[PDB]
Design goal:
29% strand, 8% helix, Carbonic_anhydrase_a-class, Carbonic Anhydrase II, acetylation, two-stranded parallel sheet, globular, 257 residues
Length: 257
């Protein structure tokens, strides 16, 4: 099955998921000189005060922080979006070294990691229905650079030792995702896809301009996770990013001048 190695990584995914070669794949390189300012775009509304995290999971690719999405508790609206999108999970992509790890790039610059906050359009009732629609998901993408520690990340880092290997989960209640956001909500937006199989072309991407800072020690803990299951040969969970895909017939729009 799919992964990030030489024999199962991104260049192979098209054989089981032919949309990998589709017209609206993600991630992409954001060329800052050609993204146009769109004064028609709104400020993004991120309303995470009532978010209810439940659990953290090592799914063998990354780890997922899961939320209760059975009510409008943690929602994204505004920006480029019509209607209301409910938070279901967040996860990260990261590198073996600080010079790689992000999925999106900015003028070909790779960040050390990228955080994806995944939200589904409430008009489709559930996540599984949403991913079948071109406007089903909104993903907030946030770059990570290595510098100062991010205090709001430490609770996640703390728990990783308990979910080392594929299939392990742990209770992860009362975690506040607001502590993962940068100061500014300036963004770029474009239509794309999930960045892991099944690569469905159901996402409005909202990529924040301002990265967050995390410490080297925080990142290093991500790189101690394992892609393998318990008692199998150790293969460090690093370099779990898909490279940039062709932009094709798309425009990237900027919320800011």
């Amino acid at each position: 099955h799919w992964g990030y190695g030489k024999h199962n990584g991104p260049e192979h995914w098209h054989k089981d998921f032919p949309i990998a070669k589709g017209e609206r794949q993600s991630p992409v390189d954001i060329d800052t000189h050609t993204a146009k300012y769109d004064p028609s775009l709104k400020p993004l509304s991120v309303s995470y005060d009532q978010a209810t995290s439940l659990r953290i999971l090592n799914n063998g690719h990354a780890f997922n922080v899961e939320f209760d999405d059975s009510q409008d508790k943690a929602v994204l609206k505004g920006g480029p979006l019509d209607g209301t999108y409910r938070l279901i999970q967040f996860h990260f992509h990261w590198g073996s070294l600080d010079g790689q790890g992000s999925e999106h790039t900015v003028d070909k610059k790779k960040y050390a990691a990228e955080l994806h906050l995944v939200h589904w359009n409430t008009k489709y009732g559930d996540f599984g229905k949403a991913v079948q629609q071109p406007d089903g998901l909104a993903v907030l993408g946030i770059f990570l650079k290595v510098g100062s520690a991010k205090p709001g990340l430490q609770k996640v880092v703390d728990v990783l030792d308990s979910i080392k290997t594929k299939g392990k989960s742990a209770d992860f209640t009362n975690f506040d995702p607001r502590g993962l956001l940068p100061e500014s909500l300036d963004y770029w937006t474009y239509p794309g896809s999930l960045t892991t199989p099944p690569l469905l072309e159901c996402v409005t991407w909202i990529v924040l301009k301002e990265p967050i800072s995390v410490s080297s020690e925080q990142v290093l803990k991500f790189r101690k996770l394992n892609f393998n299951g318990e008692g199998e040969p150790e293969e460090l969970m690093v370099d779990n990013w898909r490279p940039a895909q062709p932009l094709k017939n798309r425009q990237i729009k900027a919320s800011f001048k």
